[PDB]
Amino acid sequence: AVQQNKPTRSKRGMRRSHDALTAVTSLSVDKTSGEKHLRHHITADGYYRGRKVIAK
Amino acid sequence: MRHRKSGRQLNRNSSHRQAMFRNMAGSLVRHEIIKTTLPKAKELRRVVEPLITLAKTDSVANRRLAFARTRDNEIVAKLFNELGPRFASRAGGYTRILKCGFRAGDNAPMAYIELVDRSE
Amino acid sequence: MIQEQTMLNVADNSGARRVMCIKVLGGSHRRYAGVGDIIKITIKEAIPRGKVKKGDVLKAVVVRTKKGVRRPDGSVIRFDGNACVLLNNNSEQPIGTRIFGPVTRELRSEKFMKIISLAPEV
RNA sequence: AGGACCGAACCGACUAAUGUUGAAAAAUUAGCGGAUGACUUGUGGCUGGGGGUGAAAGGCCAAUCAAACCGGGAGAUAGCU
RNA sequence: GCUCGCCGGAAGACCAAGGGUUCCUGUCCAACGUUAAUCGGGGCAGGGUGAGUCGACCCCUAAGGCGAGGCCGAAAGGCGU
RNA sequence: CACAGGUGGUCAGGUAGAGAAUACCAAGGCGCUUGAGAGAACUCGGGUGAAGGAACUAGGCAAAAUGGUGCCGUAACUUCGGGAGAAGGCACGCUGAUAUGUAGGUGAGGUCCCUCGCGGAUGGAGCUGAAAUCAGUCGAAGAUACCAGCUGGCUGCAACU
RNA sequence: AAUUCCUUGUCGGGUAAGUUCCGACCUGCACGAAUGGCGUAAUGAUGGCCAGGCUGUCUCCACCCGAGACUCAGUGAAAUU
């Protein structure tokens, strides 16, 4: 249920070795607007694959 | 065990699921563009596209089926008067899902669902 | 599909009306007696002044089941009740003379020929 | 008529599951007993610790009871750890 | 704002008790809110509670309390007209 | 503690219902201050289940089951009250006729009388309204949902509440 | 026997099989007459036994619906050492 011995800094770090975050590999550039966006996601201005399909 | 099954539970019982998709289909037919979660849009496809397909042949029986599945006479009227004639030459694919980032409150993936020719 | 503790009707004129299976004969840990399988039974109801009497312990053969038999083409014959035919312990011949209700060809073995001969159907 | 019967409110607490660093220092759900009476309940009052009260279980007397709590004798005493 | 769902002898309305500004408006989001918060019973500021008839006070008394003289008791004090 | 608990009194709509039960609703008020996915083991709360039917287990624990109204029928024993809703059996929706709403309740006009009106017999309009027989009829099922006794036998103890 | 050690006493009933139960017996270790004896209809969230019905209790588990478990974002304990 509970420890008998305090685990160490070392074992803490080894357990945390798989906690690293994977940064975004590469952002896609819009062909019309040239904005950077996540692939298959629309741009902040509302573009996607060169077309402005967003009301705003 | 989920082998060859269809439909997402979406962490709801079946009654809440039916009511939610009824409301959401009404909203999509009304506005022609709605922001929702990605899996919800994936299921709204299956809810809304059969309804528009039903709205092709204009008959009293189809009107009553649509009203049974929608419970909104304005939505039924818009379907049979506008979206039937609009999509009458299209074999399915009346809708379009565009992924649009994540929700601030809970990091849920977000998608716009649109009717393929809304012109707004 | 007959287990221990299950009640069976009697399809013969030996006297017993209802009997209870108390051991499924065959091998060890054997679970079920189907049609054509020998069971050990105790008589729970019997007509007065019959060949057998209440409380007797003897052998029987299952001749009808609700679970039914499967035929080689894949058909199933089910019955509305489970019935058996009483037998002597040490000779395995039927106690009674008449057989009531239909039977199946699963009893087409050299030992149950006397049941098949006097059965009204099949 | 009834310390009568079935049964809500209300008063209780027989069984089971849950929960047991609980939602809760005693509860929840499903069932369960009484339910015009020796009933239940509000407001105020009285009984005080070798005392009270007790259809009596050593029960209850502010989550404390084979002798409450607070302060004192008091740094009791401890051939023991 | 529109749909959807729940309570409806209550999860609705109003009192007593208890609380004390939580009430309404403007503003702010450090901390508090088991998350975010533009919101809040949170911080800051200002406002809001109008009685011959409602309640209290008041006049009357119940259980009980206190109790001039009094009886009683080492003192304290107990009982009582 | 912004805590599944406790906290006296008043108000008491509609439909069905004996009902303040229960179901769905009105007025009114809320979705309970983390969410989004996924749809493993296992745990918790439920649904269904072939054949068998207590073989489980310390034990039918827990579950399943019964469950309503009317009529009929109702044992041992008994303190003559009971036991008793003993056990057990039958019927049950909807439509029409009897009878454009029957039996019954209320009762306008109008007649009449009057120690006199807020008046007593007549009258029956309107409104409300069981229950039953017959005939038909739909369903697998008519107490259809919620709600709603399991029954019997032998025995110890304690009269009983 | 809520009382009996030997004891699962003996015989019978009920079960295929009954240390339990029911009835009879009497060698009552160690009943007994208001610390009452023996019966007793009715009552019981009372102990024991048997039967009809019912069933996932079980043979022997299968499938399904929800809440967790698992992953993602936010906040963020504990015993122990």
Add this chain to the structure above:
RNA sequence: GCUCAACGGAUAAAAGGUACUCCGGGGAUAACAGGCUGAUACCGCCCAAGAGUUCAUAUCGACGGCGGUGUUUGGCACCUCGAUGUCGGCUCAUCACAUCCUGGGGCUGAAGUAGGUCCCAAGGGUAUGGCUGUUCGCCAUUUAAAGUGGUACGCGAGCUGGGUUUAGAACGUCGUGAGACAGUUCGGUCCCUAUCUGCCGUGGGCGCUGGAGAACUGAGGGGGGCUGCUCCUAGUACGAGAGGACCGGAGUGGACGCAUCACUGGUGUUCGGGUUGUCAUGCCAAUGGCACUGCCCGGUAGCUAAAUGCGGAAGAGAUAAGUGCUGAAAGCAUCUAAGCACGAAACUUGCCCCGAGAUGAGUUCUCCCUGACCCUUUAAGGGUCCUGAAGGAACGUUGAAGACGACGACGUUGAUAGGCCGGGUGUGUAAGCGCAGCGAUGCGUUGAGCUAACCGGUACUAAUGAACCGUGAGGCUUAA
């Protein structure tokens, strides 16, 4: 002047209960389990009076003797009292062999069937119920068999809580009583979110010496190994009969295991229908919400057992007890000393699965990269520019794959998912309308309407031009 006698004499003067209990201690000291021992227990052997129809040793074996185990009852007080939860049951097991069944064999008071006893053998298998808290035991009915023991009398941070071992109460008995009883009776709270070891699964990293994609060898590891009945040989051998085989062959079962969904079914709150009450969509008609999916009736795909396929082997090698052949020591005799031949479910293989982190990191096939300059502690060195291949990864649509990783399919050179069309399956004749009937309702249009996961098709929607990681011929020595 002391039975101050507990005799170095507490006081002149003193008994009990606590299960209502308390506090300081002690593993200095009992109960559990462990430890030492092994009287006792169990097993084994030595002698042979005797039993066994004659006959000590087929089978037993008195009087006495010697060991083994650690296994019963005990002995000791070594660990634990600043806590090592007790009996039985359930779930899950694991070893031993002193073998219960199945295999091999010697003897037999072995004619045959059936047995007894001893030796070898631990691969697999190895009851269900009534009674009782039971372990045992008795009984019923089975089976090839229902083995004996160890594992904290295995197994409560896995379940239970019937029994023992609290607090309530009662009977018998004892006691003046409080109470008590290795008597009986009814009732009576079982916490823990797993850090480490272990174990079952599944990933990330690096390594394997230039990188990458596949396909393997197989060192090593795991799984599996049970058996009944019937018929033929054969009513033969044997036997006075009664009975009745060895060896060999065939079929058909029980339990267990793997796979699967064609069948029979279960489930199927995502499909269709019936129906109760109520609210609603202005109303009729029709639908929807809610009441456990309201309650029910069926039922697709998937999952699934009760359903249906398959399996345990044969064979080989080396052997156990055992049987021998030849054969001396020891002219004979002798299975043994040399040499040779058989011999079991046990061992190694053969059967299935994992398997190169097998750091001893293996093998095979294919693919890819073939540019210039500077620098200095000259080396398997550092740096700038060009180049960025094979491939991978990431992202997306996703799966009969999956907790998450992972694994498989697909991304416009496209059937990967949704939709759509056609079919199929399921439910069972929609709505609207017409006709008949007073009406409920019935008939026709109509096997209609609707239909999830299925089958065959179809780019309608969504799977993006890109970017990202991965380099630029790959060390030394010797030898051919």
